[PDB]
From a paper:
Janus kinase (JAK) family of nonreceptor tyrosine kinases consists of JAK1–3 and TYK2 (tyrosine kinase 2) that serve as triggering kinases for cellular signaling of over 50 cytokines and hormones in regulation of blood and immune cells and metabolism. JAK2 activity is crucial for hematopoietic signaling particularly in homomeric myeloid, and hormone receptors and activating mutations of JAK2 have been identified in multiple malignancies, most notably Philadelphia chromosome-negative myeloproliferative neoplasms (MPNs), where mutated JAK2 drives the disease manifestations. MPNs are clonal neoplastic diseases initiated in the bone marrow from a mutated hematopoietic stem cell. All of these compounds are type-I inhibitors that target the conserved active conformation of the adenosine 5′-triphosphate (ATP)-binding pocket of the kinase domain and show variable target selectivity and differences in clinical profiles. Structural analysis showed that all compounds anchor to the ATP-pocket of the kinase domain of JAK2 by making two or three hydrogen bonds with the hinge region.
Pacritinib and fedratinib possessed the highest JAK2 selectivity in the binding assay. Pacritinib makes two hydrogen bonds to the hinge, to the main chain carbonyl and amide of Leu932, and a hydrogen bond with Leu855 from the β1-strand. The binding of pacritinib is also stabilized by water-mediated hydrogen bonds to Ser936 and Asp939. Pacritinib stabilizes a collapsed G-loop structure in JAK2, where Phe860 is buried within the binding site. Pacritinib and gandotinib represent the first JAK2 structures with a collapsed G-loop conformation. Interestingly, the collapsed G-loop conformation in pacritinib and gandotinib leads to ATP-pocket, which is fully closed in the direction of the G-loop. Interestingly, the binding of pacritinib and gandotinib, which both form a collapsed G-loop, is driven both by enthalpy and entropy. The favorable entropy is partly due to the desolvation of Phe860 at the tip of the G-loop, which buries itself to the ATP-pocket upon inhibitor binding. Gandotinib, pacritinib, and lestaurtinib, which make a water-mediated hydrogen bond to Asp939, could directly interact with the glutamate in this position in JAK1. Taken together, the collapsed G-loop conformation could have a selectivity benefit toward JAK2 due to a more rigid G-loop structure in JAK1 and TYK2, as demonstrated by pacritinib, which displays the highest selectivity over JAK1 of the tested inhibitors.
Author numbering: 833 to 1132
Write the structure that this text describes.
C-alpha cells in the first residue's frame, strides 16, 4: 500500500516516443514501430511498442502481468524488454521492446523464401528450443508457441516474441489449469490442454512440434495446421463439432502429415513431440541437443 511498486515512468516519456509505423493488430493487441528521441534531434533508438486494442480493466491487469513476465526474461532468443511508457499523463500503459525488423517468422517464411533453406530452418528450430529451455527455468508456460508469435531479427536470429497467454506454474504443480479460457489456438494444443485445460512444459513441447511442422511446410497455402486439420476432420464442420472431432482424431493418433521435402528424421522429432503420453515427450533440452547434433553432423 504505502510504497508503490518500483517502476521507471521517466525512462520512456510519451512526448519523446515518436510514431514511425503501424506493424500489426490482432489478438495480441496492436504493435507499432516508434523512435525514442529524448534529445529532440530526429535520432534515438527504434523500438517496438505494444498497446491494447480494448482497454478494459481485465485486459490492463493481464497486460501488467505480461509485462512483468517479459521483464523477468533475458535471453538471446527472447525479444528484449526495454521498459514501459505511462502515456496519457500516466493513465495508460504501453510496453516498450527492442525492434526486430523482419517481423513474424510466419510472415518471413512466406515473404522471404529466397533466403531460407533447411539449414536455416534447423537454426531457427534450435534457437526456439533454447528460448523455451530458458522459459522452463522460470517455470513459465508459453501456451501459444506458433510461428506467428516468433519474431525474426535477421537471417541468422529469431526470438520468441509474444507472451500474452503465458502462465506461471504454481509452486507445487507441474501444470497450470486455465480456468477462464479466452480464444484458444486449438490447432496447436496438446490433447490434455483440449480436454482438461492443463498446460505444462510438455504441452509447450507438443506446440513446438507444430511449430517445427510449420517451418518445413514453408507456410505453403493449404498446408497450415488449421487447413490440414480441417481437411482431415471435414471442411464442412463448424463450431464445437470441430473441437469434438479434433480431440477424437488426436486421441487415436491422427497427426499432421510429413511436409513435402521434410527429412524423415525431422518428421520423427515432430511425432515424438506429439505423444499423447505427456511424460514421454522429449524435453526442450533433449530437442536442442538433437537438432544441433543433426546440424553439426552435416559435412562442414
Ligand atoms: C507479429 C505480428 C505481425 O507482424 C508485426 C511486425 C513486427 C515487427 C516487425 C514487422 C512487423 O510487421 C511487418 C509487416 N507488417 C504486416 C502489416 C504491416 C507491417 N517487429 C517486432 N519487433 C519487436 C517486437 C514485436 N515486433 C512484437 C511484440 C509483441 C507482439 C507482436 C510483435 C505481434 O505478434 C508478432
Amino acid at each position: 500500500n504505502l510504497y508503490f511498486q518500483s517502476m521507471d515512468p521517466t525512462q520512456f516519456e510519451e512526448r519523446h516516443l515518436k510514431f514511425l509505423q503501424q506493424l500489426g493488430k490482432g489478438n495480441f493487441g496492436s504493435v507499432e514501430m516508434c523512435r525514442y528521441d529524448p534529445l529532440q534531434d530526429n535520432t534515438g533508438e527504434v523500438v517496438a511498442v505494444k498497446k491494447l486494442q480494448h482497454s478494459t480493466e481485465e485486459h490492463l491487469r493481464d497486460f501488467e502481468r505480461e509485462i512483468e513476465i517479459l521483464k523477468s526474461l533475458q535471453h538471446d532468443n527472447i525479444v528484449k524488454y526495454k521498459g514501459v511508457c505511462y502515456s496519457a499523463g500516466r493513465r495508460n500503459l504501453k510496453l516498450i521492446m527492442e525492434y526486430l525488423p523482419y517481423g513474424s517468422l510466419r510472415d518471413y517464411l512466406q515473404k522471404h523464401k529466397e533466403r531460407i533453406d533447411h539449414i536455416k530452418l534447423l537454426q531457427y528450430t534450435s534457437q526456439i528450443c533454447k528460448g523455451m529451455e530458458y522459459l522452463g527455468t522460470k517455470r513459465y508456460i508459453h501456451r501459444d508457441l506458433a510461428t506467428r508469435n516468433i519474431l525474426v531479427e535477421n537471417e541468422n536470429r529469431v526470438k520468441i516474441g509474444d507472451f500474452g497467454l503465458t502462465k506461471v506454474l504454481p509452486q507445487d504443480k507441474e501444470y497450470y489449469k486455465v480456468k477462464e479460457p479466452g480464444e484458444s489456438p486449438i490447432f496447436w494444443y496438446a490433447p490434455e490442454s483440449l480436454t482438461e485445460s492443463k498446460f505444462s512444459v510438455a504441452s509447450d513441447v507438443w506446440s513446438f512440434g507444430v511449430v517445427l511442422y510449420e517451418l518445413f511446410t514453408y507456410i505453403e497455402k493449404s498446408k497450415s495446421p488449421p487447413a490440414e486439420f480441417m481437411r482431415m476432420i471435414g471442411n464442412d464442420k463448424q463450431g464445437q463439432m470441430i473441437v469434438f472431432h479434433l480431440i477424437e482424431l488426436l486421441k487415436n493418433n491422427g497427426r499432421l502429415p510429413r511436409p513435402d521435402g521434410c527429412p524423415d528424421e525431422i518428421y520423427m522429432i515432430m511425432t515424438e513431440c506429439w505423444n499423447n503420453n505427456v511424460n514421454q515427450r522429449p524435453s526442450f533440452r533433449d530437442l536442442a541437443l538433437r537438432v544441433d547434433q543433426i546440424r553439426d553432423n552435416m559435412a562442414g
